[PDB]
Every structure is written in C-alpha cells, then in structure tokens.
Design a protein around this ligand. Structure first.
Ligand SMILES: [Ca+2]
Ligand SMILES: [Ca+2]
Ligand SMILES: [Ca+2]
Lengths: 219, 219, 219, 219
C-alpha cells in the first residue's frame, strides 16, 4: 500500500487540492475578521476550519510515510509540520496567541507553490552574507543601549529606564523615526550634550546600513 | 478619402498641433484652480475646455479609421481613448470625481511625446520583474493585517479595528512613518509585547524592500 | 602690462592667497553669528569684510583682462563674478536677503580649490541623465497637485487650499514625512477614500525615485 | 625572560582567555543595569570588574614588551591601550562619562576577534573615498547653517538661534525627520518663503547622499 500512497501524495492533483484549500482557508480567515459575518456564518466557518485542519494533519501524516527522514531535513516540510502543529493546540488554555498564530498557515501558500519558494529562498540566501555585519551591529546596539540606560534612564525612564527600553528607543532612532522632535530635543532640555551621543550613533548606524545594502548589491 | 486623412493624421503638423493643445489646456487647468481667475475669465476657460474636448474626440475618431484594430492593441492609444472618454461623461451625475479625473488628460503629454514614452516604458518594464516579490509582500501584508486586526482591533479600533484599517496602518509602519511614537508605544501601554509583532514585521518588510531595490539595480 | 599681470594672476601665490582669504572670511562669518562676538569686534569684522570685498573685485577685474571672453564661458568663473556681485549691493535698500546671500561667497572654496571642482562636476554631470525622469515627475506632481487642490482644498485649505500649497504638501508626502498621521488620517475623517489618492501617489513617486537611484548606479 | 613571555602572550590560550573575559564582563555589565541585581550582587560585580581591569593592564603591559614600537603603530592595539586607560581613571573625579565610557571596552570583542577586525576594516576602508563628498557637505552645511541663523534665529531661537542650533536643526531636516510639520510649516507662519530655503536644501543634501551611496557601490 506504500507505493499506493506515494502515488497519491505525489499526485499533481494532491498538491493542487492542497493549494486549493490554502486559498479557501485564507479567504475564510479574512471573513472571520468581520464581527458581522461571524454572526451570520460563524458556525459555517468554524467547522470549515476544523475540517481543513484535519485534512492538513492527514496530509502531513501521509507526507511522512512517503518521505520519513528526508521530510525532517526539508525546511519547507518542517515548517508545514510546525505550522499545523500550532493549529492543533486546542481552542483554549495557555496563551491566546496560539489562536492567532493559526493564521500563519497561510504561509503554506509560499511552501506549496514554487517560484514563491524560489523567491523566499532567493531572499533567505542573502542572510548568511550579512551575518558578520549583523553581529557587529548587535554588539554595537548592546554597547550603546547600556550607555544610554545609565546616562538617561533616571530622568527618562520611559525611553531609557531599562536595558530593553534603550534597545527599543535606539531601534527607533535607527529607523530615524521621530528621533529629534521626539527623543533628543527632549533629552537635551536636561542633558544639553545628548546630541554627542545620538549624532555619532546615527552616523555609525546609517553608514553601516548603507554598506550592507552595497554588499547585497555585489553578491 | 482614407489616404487623404491618413496623410492628415500622420502629419507632423497634426501631432505637434495636438502637443500644442495639451500644454495649453494644462496651462488652462492650473488657472482653473484660482477662485480669482475663475470669477474673471471662468466662462472663457470652460468653453476653451469644451472646445479642446471636441478637437480631441475628432482626433481619436480619425486616429481609429487610420489604424482600426492596430489602435486597440496600442497601450498608448488605449490610454488616450480612455482618458478622453472620462472627459466625455457630462459635468453632471454619478460621482464628481469624474469631473476631477479630467485632469488625467495631461498625461497625454507623456503619450504624445516620445522620450517620455521611452522613460515611462523603461520604468514600466521593470515591473514584471518585481511581481514575484510583490506577490510575496501582499501575502505577508494580508497575513499580518489579519493577525493585527485580531490582536489590537478591540482596544485600538481606529488603527486596527477592521482588516482595511490594519492594512493601512501596516502600510504606514512599513513606510516607517511615525510608527513608534504614533502606534507601537501606544499599543504597548496596553499590550507590553506588541514590540514582538512590529519589529519582526519591520525587519522583514525592510529586508524585502532592500532586495527588491538591488534586484532592480541589476536587471 | 598685460603679460606683467598675466604673470601676477596665474601665479601660484595669487591663487593660494585667494584661498587663504576665503577660509578667513568664512571663519569671520561664523563669528559674526555671535551677538557676543559682534558687540566687541563688530567693527573689526565689518571692515575686514569690506576689505575682502574689494580684494575680490580687484581680482575679478584682474582675472577678466587675463581671460577676456574665455572667462564668461567658464562656469566656475561666472559663478565668482555673480557671487562677488551679490556682495557689492550696498548693505541696505531693496531686500535683506542680499545681505544674507553674501555668505554664498564661501562657495568660492569649491570654485577656487581643485578637487572640489572635481567632485562638484562629478555630481553635476549626473544631472543630465536624470532630466527625462525629473520632467516626468514634475508633470506627475503638477497633475496630482491640481487634483488635490480641487479635492481637498475647501475643507483643508492650509494644506491643499492653493495650487502651490498642494505642491508643498505633496512634496512632504513624497519625502514620506509625517504623511499618515499628519495628513491622510486627518483628511480621512472627512473623505474616507482619500487613501485611494495618496497610496497610489506614494507608490508611483517611490517607484520612480528608486529607478532614478538605480539609473545613477549604472551611468 | 622575553621569549618565555613572548610565548605566553602569543598563545592561543592567552588570546582565547582574553576573548573569555570580554564576553564575561560584557554579560556582567548588562547585569549592572538592573537596580534589582545591584541590590543583591553589586559587590560581586564591582570586584569582578576591578579584577578584569587588572588582568587587562597586565596584558597590555605584557603585549607591549613583546611588540615594543610595533605596538604603538597597530590601530587595534592603540585602541585597546586607550580603552583600558579610560577604565583606569578612578571611579571618582573629573566627569562621570568616564565611568560610563568604560563600557567601550566591550568593543575589544571586535579588536580581539578576527572577521570582526576584517569587517570593521572593510568598512573603515570605504571612508577615504568619501572624504571628497564629506568635505563638500560640511562646507554646504556650514554655509546654510550660517544663513539660517541670520534668517530664522530671532523669531525661532530654539531651532536656529545659534550657529550650533542651526547645525542640529539642519541635520534633522537632512534626515528628513519631521522636517515639515515640525520646522518648515511653523517657520512659514512667519516667513512665507522659508520653503525657498529648505526645499533646495533638501534636494541638494539628498542628491549628494544618493551619489555617495552609488559611489560606494562602485569602489
Ligand atoms: Ca518620520
Ligand atoms: Ca513625526
Ligand atoms: Ca505632535
């Protein structure tokens, strides 16, 4: 019966039946957004939901017999497994991010369809080339975030009071987001020289960031 | 009479005459902005306007006898037809955006003058090569837009209350617009972890965007 | 006496002397900024200034005999003429921008010192290859600025009330500066569909500017 | 005794022991951030700090016998000498930035681990080819900053009141930060033409920066 199912799983039909459900379950999840819609056809789509979820574990069980070890060394398969696994954790208990994390299954449209896989893969592949830089910056952020916490967090604890807060504010400054009118002019009414911290910070981070784009434009 | 008019239409004088009317009517529309100018010479202008509109349909009628099907297979001609058609719906009735949409005829200056055509075409041609990425993005946006509506729409209905609002807000975050003081710091007064939703969102979206710029800086 | 002065003007000493005055007059202009400095050495500097102004016209007078027509066809020289000219309009009558426009003479450091001429020229030379785009864009802005003045200027006259205002506001959206919370969300409290105007505007304007950067990174 | 210590210093063990102290002290500094942690283990971590500070001077003393003059011509070594020296200045007297500047030693993780060294050097190397643009710009900034102080600093002293203030505000405009609703629209309530100063300023400054990115993507 093994080859019987290896023929079912690998069937163009099967993969297209899968892609058909993703597009349906996605259309259905956007409808679950409507407080109106749920009052009318809520029970329709709760069931439609549990239905698709079963079908998906059935596939994943089926997909594993056909592939075994090869399957748990496939990124896309591992993914598909974990994204359905999330979707199996009861509609209750623990955290309710798990209910919300269920919509991650629409990323299966990326998995199940090539060209997407190509594109995602194309993208992901650029990351290893960025890791020396990314490491550098994260060291850098860590260093300034400490500096900022101990220089400004007493008077400005919303923004710098804690190591994590400083990470966040520094991230915001880095996105050049509302940084002057929002953070540093305020800081300067108390610490006139705060500009000496944030201007060099900005330079380094924007400089570095430009290089990283130029590096991604030579690989 | 066909070759008589094919010799009229294809004439340098004709095209240049058309280009003459565009720049005049365009000048004319900027004057139609002034509440002052309109009290003085408003009548002068609406008639010159209707005049121009006639002249333009005559041309397009003529242009078609001289090209027949070849015409409705020309992007630039199709454009011109559709823009004048917009300008044909009476100043009355339905939606009044139609009166406003008239000013789209000044895009005929792009259409009637080469080099522009060159540049537009040059630009537009880059688009097909982005569609794999644009699909990827739209899926991403759809998925996060759904999560956000269900994670934040109850306490923050202005920004996330509805799927469309979430799309808009997410777009705003993506343009890195006033995203921290404006949205996430608020969000966090209620949902301390909202940073776990928006920073990864910001990274992915900015990463994808960098790749897409480099993809262009190659093809 | 021509060759006597053609030997004075073309001299290394002459040029390095000019450069020495520029850096000094520049230093002297940053000091004229301080109300403190001006209350104690204000006279020292106003005269130093009137001095340097003569020295510069003398040079330009000298420089002209030595080059004649060749001069009024050199970009860099023409510049220095007009810049010193600005500095000759008496400190009074007319407008006071002319007094402020005097500090433009510090651009002579670019004009009179090689390398800067190199870099400026390197930069400027890129401009011709952007002109098809710059035109394209201005048509676009002109068209949308007209649309916006008639779509939003009655309720929002600060921002869209006049053709030029729409130009300014549109510029701001294009720099993606404070565009959503500052302008479109407010606009949407009255015109729910305003998002239909500004999102496409943003896309086009952003797309085009990316291409333009890429164009420069080819030519 | 030289070859004995030259064999201690040059050892894989020594270097990796150094790398071990950095990641330990760095971890320990993140803990010194917590007001909680300090109330429990502050003594522990103050002493651990002085320990590491000794060990680092010992090394720098050692590293110098083994290299002599070769050492004070090594950038990376020069760095470490200075960085430890900052950490030597008592935890009292002078300023308190000297206490804060101590966290700079964690940059030794860049200095004491290649690839980092590689990456930093890769970056720094890009600088010399920017200095022609960078010089140009600071002239540009200096010129406009002076203009702005005399055009806007009387009615608007917080933003343009002083040359230094104009530099800061001009920087903010350059990052295009909240430049319009924050600065130029206000300015225009008093000086309608202030847009004539800031729009060109914006163009020039962004153009130059676009060129500089393209330059770095050539060399
Ligand atoms: Ca901003
Ligand atoms: Ca803002
Ligand atoms: Ca505000």
């Amino acid at each position: 019966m093994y080859l019987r199912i290896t023929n079912i799983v690998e069937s163009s039909f099967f993969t297209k039946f899968i892609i058909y459900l993703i597009v349906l379950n996605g259309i259905t999840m956007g409808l679950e957004t409507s407080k109106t819609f749920m009052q009318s056809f809520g029970v329709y789509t709760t069931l439609f939901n549990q239905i698709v979820i079963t079908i998906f574990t059935i596939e994943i069980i089926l997909r594993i017999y056909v592939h075994r070890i090869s399957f748990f060394k496939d990124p896309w398969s591992l993914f598909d497994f974990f994204v359905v696994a999330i979707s199996l954790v009861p509609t209750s208990s623990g955290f309710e991010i798990l209910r919300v994390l269920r919509v991650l299954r629409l990323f299966r449209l990326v998995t199940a369809v090539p060209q997407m896989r190509k594109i995602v893969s194309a993208l992901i592949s650029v990351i290893p080339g960025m890791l020396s830089v990314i490491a550098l910056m994260t060291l850098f952020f860590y260093i300034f975030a400490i500096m900022a916490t101990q220089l400004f967090g007493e008077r400005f604890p919303e923004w710098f009071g804690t190591l994590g807060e400083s990470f966040y504010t520094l991230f915001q400054v880095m996105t050049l987001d509302d940084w002057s009118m929002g953070i540093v002019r305020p800081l300067m009414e108390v610490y006139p020289y705060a500009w000496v911290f944030f201007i060099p910070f900005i330079f380094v981070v924007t400089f570095v960031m430009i290089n990283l784009v130029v590096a991604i434009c030579v690989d």
